């Protein structure tokens, strides 16, 4: 027998795969044919997609077919190569090798594109297009890739919930009649709202009223033993400039003196003037807490605070009611404290047909004009506490404080918040100052520097509690708010309120 040799086929292109670009090209095939009785010049034959290609063995045992159609190789992924040789005596032999290759006519095109917008698709793979007549393909998510009359492909990116359990990477595969496919992968990017800063303003009115001296009188009480009312003395209450009865005392003393209240007006400091929208101390209220036999104390007492307002004087009387709790005394010093609660009463008066209201604010620690105002005070047995009795004069019926409203989604000087493509935008956080996160203050009253804000989830707000004396020129409130869209994207902005006085 003649001796068969070894016939090998090199990779069909470098990656041993015919792809969509190679599909339209002419491909060189090559291999080796060595050993046995294979001789330079021997015939090499192969059938690929039913076309026979032939060549001869070259020096080095090499063989090459100059040009096979890529379409033939795409149609036929396996073929034998047959070399015909002879030995010296003329015996003939066929040496056979087998070639396989892969066919992958696909190509991918990958994009990352904002939801809710149309996008021109750039840098598409070479040869990309639609089958003839097709001008639109629908993507997996119901978006579209449209071929325009300008030759460009545009993707209409659907809005997605980027917070849920469903991938937001869209895709579509275009199949062409020659076998090519183009897979366009479209990673849809989330959008977000843009909160824009808001400006609002409010002006608190100023007014100076001329007032007479004050005359405070205990005028009535309920319960109590040995109850007396009297104008204060050096020994009981301190002295004041009028004969009105500023002191009240009660109880059968169980140790030394009687419990009671005293009120020393602020006539000297006031200098016959009240101001509008301004916490004013009308006097110093002292609670004298002594031990008295249980059962002998008042439960309430009423004090008339009388003064005149200059227009013609119009007398005004503010009735101040105090609830009194002379608590049974134990060995707990705190539980044995006696408790005074002042009621939130007011009086309305008229000056020049313009009406105003004096309202009780409460008790403020003496000397601390910036201190907290409280309506209940606590005094140890065998002690006296003193507090300024603070009122405020407001315009009208005193039903509300100076206020302004708005909505932070409106254009408030710098444009309206942008809601993004997801929508379902609500306010999820609000805070005084520069920093805000989703929090529990939306729809709740929160305290600023000069007043209180209620900002609701739909952006609506109502905002001044400060006294005029505490509002400097150029005073500004700043509240940070946070808006959030359907799938959690957030944006913050500041609501700035100019607080002026007039």
């Amino acid at each position: 027998e003649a001796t068969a040799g070894t016939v090998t086929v090199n990779a069909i292109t470098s990656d041993d795969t015919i792809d969509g670009i190679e599909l339209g090209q002419t491909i060189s095939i090559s291999g080796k044919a060595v050993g046995g009785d294979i001789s330079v010049g021997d015939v090499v034959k192969m059938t690929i997609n039913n076309t026979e290609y032939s060549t001869t063995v070259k020096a080095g045992g090499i063989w090459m077919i100059a040009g096979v159609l890529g379409s033939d190789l795409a149609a036929d992924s396996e073929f034998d190569v047959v070399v015909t040789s002879s030995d010296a005596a003329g015996n003939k032999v066929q040496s056979i090798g087998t070639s396989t290759h892969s066919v992958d006519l696909s190509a991918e095109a990958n994009f990352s594109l904002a939801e809710g917008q149309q996008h021109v698709l750039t840098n598409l793979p070479e040869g990309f297009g639609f089958p003839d007549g097709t001008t639109e393909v629908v993507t997996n998510f119901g978006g579209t890739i449209t071929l325009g009359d300008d030759g460009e492909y545009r993707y209409d990116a659907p809005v997605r919930d980027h917070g849920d359990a469903v991938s937001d990477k869209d895709s579509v595969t275009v199949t062409l009649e020659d076998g090519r496919t183009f897979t366009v992968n479209l990673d849809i990017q989330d959008s977000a709202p843009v909160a824009v800063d808001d400006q609002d303003s409010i002006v608190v009115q100023h007014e100076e009223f001329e007032v007479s001296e004050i005359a405070a009188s205990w005028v009535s009480y309920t319960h109590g033993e040995s109850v007396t009312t009297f104008d204060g003395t050096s020994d009981l209450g301190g002295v004041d400039n009028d004969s009105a009865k500023d002191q009240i005392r009660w109880g059968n003393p169980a140790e030394s003196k009687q419990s009671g209240y005293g009120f020393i007006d602020n006539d000297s400091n006031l200098e016959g003037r009240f101001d509008l929208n301004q916490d004013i101390s009308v006097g110093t209220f002292t609670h004298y807490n002594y031990p008295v036999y249980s059962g002998g104390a008042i439960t309430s007492a009423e004090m008339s605070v009388e003064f005149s307002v200059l227009d013609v004087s119009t007398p005004v009387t503010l009735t101040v009611n105090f609830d009194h709790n002379e608590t049974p005394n134990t060995n707990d010093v705190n539980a044995s404290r006696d408790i005074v609660t002042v009621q939130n009463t007011h009086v309305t008066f008229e000056r020049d047909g313009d009406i105003y209201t004096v309202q009780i604010v409460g008790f403020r620690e003496v000397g601390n004009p910036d201190g907290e105002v409280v309506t209940s005070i606590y005094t140890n047995e065998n002690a006296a506490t003193s507090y300024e009795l603070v009122v405020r004069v407001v315009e009208g019926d005193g039903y509300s404080l100076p206020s302004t409203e708005g909505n932070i989604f409106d254009d408030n000087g710098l444009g309206a918040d942008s809601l993004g493509a997801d929508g379902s935008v609500t306010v999820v956080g609000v805070a005084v100052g520069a920093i805000v996160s989703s929090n529990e203050s939306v729809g709740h009253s929160i305290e600023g520097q000069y007043g209180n804000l209620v900002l609701n989830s739909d952006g609506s707000y109502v905002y001044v509690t400060a006294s005029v004396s505490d509002i400097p020129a150029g005073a500004t409130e700043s509240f940070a708010y946070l808006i959030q869209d359907q799938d959690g994207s957030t944006s913050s902005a500041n609501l700035s309120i100019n607080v002026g006085t007039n």
């Binding site: 169980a254 008295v292 059962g295 104390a297 002379e326 049974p328 005394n329």
Partner: peptide, 4 residues
């Protein structure tokens, strides 16, 4: 309990 007695005094208050």
């Amino acid at each position: 309990g007695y005094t208050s």
